[model samples]
Target: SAKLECPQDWLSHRDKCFHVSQVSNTWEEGLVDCDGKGATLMLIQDQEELRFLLDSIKEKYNSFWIGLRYTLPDMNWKWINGSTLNSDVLKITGDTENDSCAAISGDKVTFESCNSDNRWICQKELYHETLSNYVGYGH
Candidate 1:
């Protein structure tokens, strides 16, 4: 076994790896960007992770798209992972309309049209399959 690790250049916090985009892209575009990297949009799990991303966005002064959305049919807020949003995880603060998506802006969970271009965060579990010294002639 190997130590937990994030992919190159991705931020490591707790047991997950986070990637913040440098250029803006639509929610769907950002979605595919992360998917291409084998990760999905940011899924805030708790206070610790929430605060971590909050600080990052504030420092960069850029809004970052996350995985929450107010999709229709079900008429409920949902996550990209297909789970209903646990309201207590983060109280969404702006443009609370149906079909609006979520993002982090300043110190709040922002709601905006999914077609808006914005930077985003991607989350993935840490990998434990590689070891620096495991490159042995014969282990």
Candidate 2:
């Protein structure tokens, strides 16, 4: 087995690395930026992860684009990783008619138009390194 490491300028947690954008961009553009860095839009997995993300943001007043969106036809909100939105972890506004993208500001998660410019969060799995060279003491 191998240990994993995150790239520079990225924050690590468990097996993933996260990066927060300093500038604002449209949801689609944000996706591209993340892709360029070998990551995708952040997909919050649980309430703890959501809390961790909010606390990690230095700018409390700025809203950042997340990986959640309203899917077409069914109009269901889903994560970019094909996971269903967990109501327990998301603070969704009742209004979803006009907004297709989800953005987070502090503890609040609100839906916004996909074209809206906003800072964003990106997530990627860390690369693993082999540990075969390590020497072990007797148990």
Candidate 3:
């Protein structure tokens, strides 16, 4: 008999990944989870990652608070690490121009105030290791 495998419920947008959880936590808590998993909440690496995440996980109801934020005056979108927003795929809306953070819920972009609380998407690279060995005791 063949075994069945469950698909990853999270959204895999290109090389970037995202998942929305019912668990709502503060930004610090969310950051901790991502950190514990050896990854940040969500950092837009490139256009492909941004586009894939937006297109893949838009239908879900709840919005996810990404790792981006707006703190600078001229630039509203900034990563948690204070990196400038460089992804071209992130559509900048006029009304949401001042928003500090970004979220996705079915091919849509929602901006939120920096202080707003929302769930976060923790991302990390998957790793695998293989080892082959044999030991024998001789008398």
Candidate 4:
């Protein structure tokens, strides 16, 4: 199986590539920009992706949003992509006492009121290449 390669000039944060803009934008706008670039807001699935994003952004500059949220009071958290929440790898820090959006702190998880505006990370699905030909090892 062939794996997708990160684009040149793009920073590799775990399995995804990132580009930061100094201009602050709301999460929705950020999401749109990412989609325009063939990506969606970063949907962190596991600890590895989480760690890479956190470590890469640490001390570099601005904070960005992930793709999970508690849409309503007493509601289960859901990913922006419509996937069920994967709690094993996510470390939610909010009280959950009220509806809140999810974000990452370094490598930890946290939540905020959905109304709060913030920057977000968008991601695109990895493209895989199929091998069309093969050759034996050279003598």
Residues 1-139, candidate 3: write the lDDT tens digits.
1122213654654444455555677656776777775566776666566556555545556667667665435444556654455434445432233555666544545666645566777654332112211111101
lDDT, model 3: 0.54
**Candidate 3: where is the Cα deviation over 4 Å?**
1-19, 54-58, 93-99, 125-139
Candidate 2 lDDT over 1-139, as tens digits, reads 1137658787766656678886899888888888888887877665666666766786657878877776554445666667656654555633345556888876777777879879999977553211111111111
Report the candidate with higher lDDT, 1 versus 4: 1
Q: Local error of candidate 2 at 16, Å? A: 2.6
**Whole-model lDDT values for every prediction:** 0.67, 0.68, 0.54, 0.56
TM-score of each model, in listed order: 0.75, 0.77, 0.59, 0.66
lDDT of 1 at 126: 56
Q: Write the per-residue lDDT of candidate 4 for residues 31-115, one digit (tens) a residue.
A: 6777777766666655666666665567434457666665444355566666545555655632354656775545566666544
Q: List the residue pairs that clash in candidate 1.
A: none
Q: By summed lDDT, which 10 consecutive residues of candidate 2 come out lowest?
A: 130-139
Model 1 per-residue lDDT tens digits across residues 1-139: 1137767767767767788886899998898888988887877665677777765555645678888776555445566866455445555632334677888877666678889878888877553111111111111
Candidate 4 backbone clash number:
4
Give the Cα RMSD of candidate 1.
13.0
Candidate 3 collision pairs:
58-105, 58-106, 58-107, 59-106, 70-100
Q: Candidate 2 — what's its lDDT?
A: 0.68
Clashes of each: 0, 0, 5, 4
